[PDB]
Design a protein around this ligand. Sequence first.
Ligand SMILES: Nc1ncnc2c1ncn2[C@@H]1O[C@H](COP(=O)(O)OP(=O)(O)OP(=O)(O)O)[C@@H](O)[C@H]1O
Ligand SMILES: Nc1ncnc2c1ncn2[C@@H]1O[C@H](COP(=O)(O)OP(=O)(O)OP(=O)(O)O)[C@@H](O)[C@H]1O
Ligand SMILES: Nc1ncnc2c1ncn2[C@@H]1O[C@H](COP(=O)(O)OP(=O)(O)O)[C@@H](O)[C@H]1O
Ligand SMILES: Nc1ncnc2c1ncn2[C@@H]1O[C@H](COP(=O)(O)OP(=O)(O)O)[C@@H](O)[C@H]1O
Lengths: 512, 512
Amino acid sequence: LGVGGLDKEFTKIFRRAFASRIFPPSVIEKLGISHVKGLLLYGPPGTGKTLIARKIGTMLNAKEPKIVNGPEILSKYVGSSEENIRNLFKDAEAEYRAKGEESSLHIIIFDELDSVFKQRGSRGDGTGVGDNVVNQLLAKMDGVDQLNNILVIGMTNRKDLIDSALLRPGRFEVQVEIHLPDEKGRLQIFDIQTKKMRENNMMSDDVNLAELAALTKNFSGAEIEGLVKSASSFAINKTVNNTKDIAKLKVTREDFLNALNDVTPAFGISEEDLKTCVEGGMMLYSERVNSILKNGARYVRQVRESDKSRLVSLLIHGPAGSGKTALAAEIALKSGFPFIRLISPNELSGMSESAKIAYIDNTFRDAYKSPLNILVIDSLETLVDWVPIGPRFSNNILQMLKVALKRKPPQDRRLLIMTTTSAYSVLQQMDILSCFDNEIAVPNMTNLDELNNVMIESNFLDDAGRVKVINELSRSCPNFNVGIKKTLTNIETARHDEDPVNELVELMTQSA
Amino acid sequence: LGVGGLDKEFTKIFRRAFASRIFPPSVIEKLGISHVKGLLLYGPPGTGKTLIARKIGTMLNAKEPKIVNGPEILSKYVGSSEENIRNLFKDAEAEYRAKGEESSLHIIIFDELDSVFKQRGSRGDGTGVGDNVVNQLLAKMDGVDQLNNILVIGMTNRKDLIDSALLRPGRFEVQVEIHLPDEKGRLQIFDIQTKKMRENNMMSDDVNLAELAALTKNFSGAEIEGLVKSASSFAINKTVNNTKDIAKLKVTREDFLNALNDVTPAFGISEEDLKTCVEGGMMLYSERVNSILKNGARYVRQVRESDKSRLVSLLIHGPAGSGKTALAAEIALKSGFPFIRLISPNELSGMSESAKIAYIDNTFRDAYKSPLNILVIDSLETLVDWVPIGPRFSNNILQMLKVALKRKPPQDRRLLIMTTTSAYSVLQQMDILSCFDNEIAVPNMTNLDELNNVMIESNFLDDAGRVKVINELSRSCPNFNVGIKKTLTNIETARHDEDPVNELVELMTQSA
Ligand SMILES: Nc1ncnc2c1ncn2[C@@H]1O[C@H](COP(=O)(O)OP(=O)(O)OP(=O)(O)O)[C@@H](O)[C@H]1O
Ligand SMILES: Nc1ncnc2c1ncn2[C@@H]1O[C@H](COP(=O)(O)OP(=O)(O)OP(=O)(O)O)[C@@H](O)[C@H]1O
Ligand SMILES: Nc1ncnc2c1ncn2[C@@H]1O[C@H](COP(=O)(O)OP(=O)(O)O)[C@@H](O)[C@H]1O
Ligand SMILES: Nc1ncnc2c1ncn2[C@@H]1O[C@H](COP(=O)(O)OP(=O)(O)O)[C@@H](O)[C@H]1O
């Protein structure tokens, strides 16, 4: 005991990796079988793998597990690395000659395994550093030097990089996956972490753990440890400057609520980028805008409450300066989904091409590990480096994006994608219009009534003047055609001049 | 005894490689012949090669075979690699001086042979690691230092890489192939594996091995051994938590049936990818769909009960959104074949060009080792990276695929191939249309009756409302042209709205 939220996995591991070790050697001999010598656990970081490995050892009363780290061995000098691997198994070798089939169990943990394979074959074999450890390790548990006391546990974050040679029977025969916890699991983790405080009357009676289990929506276990530590920090600092009356120390609900603002999770919301940069006003100057927002809300609920629709892709298009991005963000912030991210040119500035591919792929990879997700892609045509003189563009990134937009996430998960563009004709010429499930159009302003609404909404000036602007434009140029960004960047400059009324009309004539 | 399914090969090996060692030396000298010093076995892994190697030795009462692993020798430092070969034969050299012609037989096993040749000539010769072992090895069995007590066995999974110089007489004269077992072979392997349970009264009376032999369709030996071990795991875990009344332990049929869900074989069915990703509905909305499914069933039965047709290939083509892939998958799952795989852009994402070529070639190789096989190739034009601005595309992959679609499998095996494409004219220009034997076209929806059927079958809403949609469309736009995918996306997006009828009408008019 000491682990929460992983009952089913625990039963599965114990049935296969350890159950046969409990029985006396006689019956195992009489059945005619041989023990399992490899187990592979995979999943995201900070989720509780090493803890399971450690706690299973305590029931069997084996020795304390030895631990080894991948880059440690790989980074040492060649000769030392070659000599190192033989030093790990010495104790297990000795006890076998001592006691044979009655020997006690020895458990070895191997961490960041994939790092050994993550290199080109030429460098791995010519240098030999990558291949040497793998070969010696397989020799010690499969070949003629077979040693019958050991059990090896390997831990990885990316299963697809492990070579298939290692997965066949006789080597790493059992594989298990660990998931981010759900609400009930987090309730248990909170209990395990606050037990010691609760049992010494150092925790206040206003704390309700069921509510915290609902606020911490997409957290892992390590994050919960951090949250408790920060809460305790509040209570400790309130008394220092070391004083009398330490015996009345107690943590309180306010401490936790303030703690939430200091620990931010991975797999969370990129709040600042969406809120500040992309949204500096929202005003309902026409019926079309309200229509667009209602359609967006439709799609959000559609994704949230159906099992047929687990991938929806949309394209928002229109002229430059119309409003696209701000709309996308506005749809995202009202959703309430736990996971939201955006890919934009700002993030990829200053990189080489290969780096760009790696970044995009890791982002999509991370989107596949939570129950609900949203992704925003900004200005597709710029990510591909389009210039029309050549024309010139990067084909590899285009193919990466083309494949990513159609793939479906695994195991009853679901995501939504929004993308924004200003060069619809180019996308038509590159024939990737078959990826998007629906299209939305954003038009400019073309009636003077809309202008009046915008002026009313931004507190331009009293009615008497706003009438004059419309009257002058009525026969200056009644057929104008301008976006919203420009209109709201001409009102700003007009306000700080000496003749507001005569300045805005001229700027509007010029833009049209 | 201890091996099953390989009687013919046992006879043929014993007749050539060993029969001469039994006779007294007088008669062998008296005929004037010489013993054979090389034997090569090739076949897929986990099929029983080292087993036969060990078992043949115990009849002759030779010394326990020494074993050496290729990459082990190649990965060591250069000096020790050159020195170590000479240590392998030391004992054999000793006994020859000791006793002369009357010595006993010495048997040396060499594993993963092809690895030594799998390198460029420049690196192999300049470094010398690859060439040195080969040269020193041939010296000991062919040259003036010929040693007359040894026998060398080579073991490899790919014969095409071994150089033709080694196979000539005096070196590795005899070559043999190992196959995956057929039904009777599996029936024998089960007996060999379950003997010790049966002889100690630890196996129930309901287990019938003839049924298990028929369920496990493309298993090799190692998978059958793992299957027995997993069933034992079930029987053991049911008591723990180590108790009284261990003596009544017994395995049972339920355990085997449950064990089938835990061991998944190579050369099996990739169920999840075909089932989940590709099929999220199937509804018979017209006569053309019935016709297509019936044609597919026809071809399957053709491939299964004829000797003249050992290779068939089909092309399914039509507009984007028509239904293609889901059809292919539907035809595949109903077939009941043992082996099914598919190649799609998802598996090849993020690879270099050389890696892609290697992956495709390995897949086609793995297809040629079972009686019946199905392959599905999805979105051909995306595999080649087509973009029409240049145009730009990869020529090497195209030539690889063009060769692969005509090659016929060896030795009375047979396969069926299906491929899907949306760019028929592009392939017309590439001139690869001569590879396919038949062509199927999938059309779009063009009648209101079909739409009625689709609405009825998806439970859209009660009849009273269902009639009104058809009424309104009958005079809004009677000549519409839309695929199935977009229809089933508009339906769902109209169920979660406040006025389903108007919303559906507007969307469907826009798509048409
Ligand atoms: N109703 C509205 N719709 C859209 N944007 C609005 C609205 N009201 C105010 N705005 C503001 O107007 C600005 C619109 O500029 P935005 O960056 O979204 O343009 P864009 O279409 O993405 O153009 P670009 O081609 O330059 O990327 C934002 O600051 C947004 O907050
Ligand atoms: N009778 C049917 N025929 C084909 N597809 C059907 C049928 N009934 C339902 N569907 C559904 O139609 C959906 C769309 O089909 P599918 O994904 O195979 O299209 P596609 O031709 O591969 O398109 P793309 O151009 O995107 O590659 C599938 O999810 C399938 O489940
Ligand atoms: N399921 C869990 N229950 C309780 N504590 C957990 C859990 N998962 C992680 N932890 C906390 O995480 C810390 C160690 O996690 P760690 O060993 O880093 O996992 P990983 O295998 O991801 O490295 C411990 O201090 C432990 O309290
Ligand atoms: N044809 C067979 N008959 C009996 N046992 C087999 C057979 N094939 C494989 N096995 C099982 O496989 C194990 C050894 O296979 P292995 O020596 O790894 O063959 P190879 O490595 O040459 O493919 C043994 O435990 C044996 O019980």
